[PDB]
Design a protein around this ligand. Sequence first.
Ligand SMILES: Nc1ncnc2c1ncn2[C@@H]1O[C@H](CSCC[C@H](N)C(=O)O)[C@@H](O)[C@H]1O
Ligand SMILES: [Zn+2]
Length: 148
Amino acid sequence: SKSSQYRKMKTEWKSNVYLARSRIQGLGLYAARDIEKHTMVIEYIGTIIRNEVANRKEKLYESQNRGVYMFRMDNDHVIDATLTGGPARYINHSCAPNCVAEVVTFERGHKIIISSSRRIQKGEELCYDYKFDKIPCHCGAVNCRKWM
Ligand SMILES: Nc1ncnc2c1ncn2[C@@H]1O[C@H](CSCC[C@H](N)C(=O)O)[C@@H](O)[C@H]1O
Ligand SMILES: [Zn+2]
């Protein structure tokens, strides 16, 4: 049951991850322990805001040469982790991910859950495919698409 998986992950995620210097860019999130395939690791949390508001914010931050932490969604909304976020905001992109950022809709709502797509060893850096629609990718993978 997704909702039981979710409830369990919500009380465990702190022991699933840690924050350290990335092998990809800046800071990154790492598996604190071994994690089985198809397992909820952590949630992307923040404040859901309309695209219009998000764009204004991004534009304001770029003026000071700062990035934002935002997970773009299909409903013209965004989860804004720039001010109130969690560790999942630090998970980097990979052309060869060990994770997926999946939509999970259930009793408690419409959530973005990061889950393992393979067995993941302690100390591996976590990453998922950001899925793009233009700056160079540093995921290091063999089949890197070179750009983001
Ligand atoms: N595979 C990749 N190659 C190059 N830059 C990446 C990347 N994955 C993530 N990033 C960078 O990280 C941002 C997502 S925020 C993720 C955490 C970030 N590494 C940090 O230290 O704050 C992107 O805007 C991009 O600047
Ligand atoms: Zn890449």
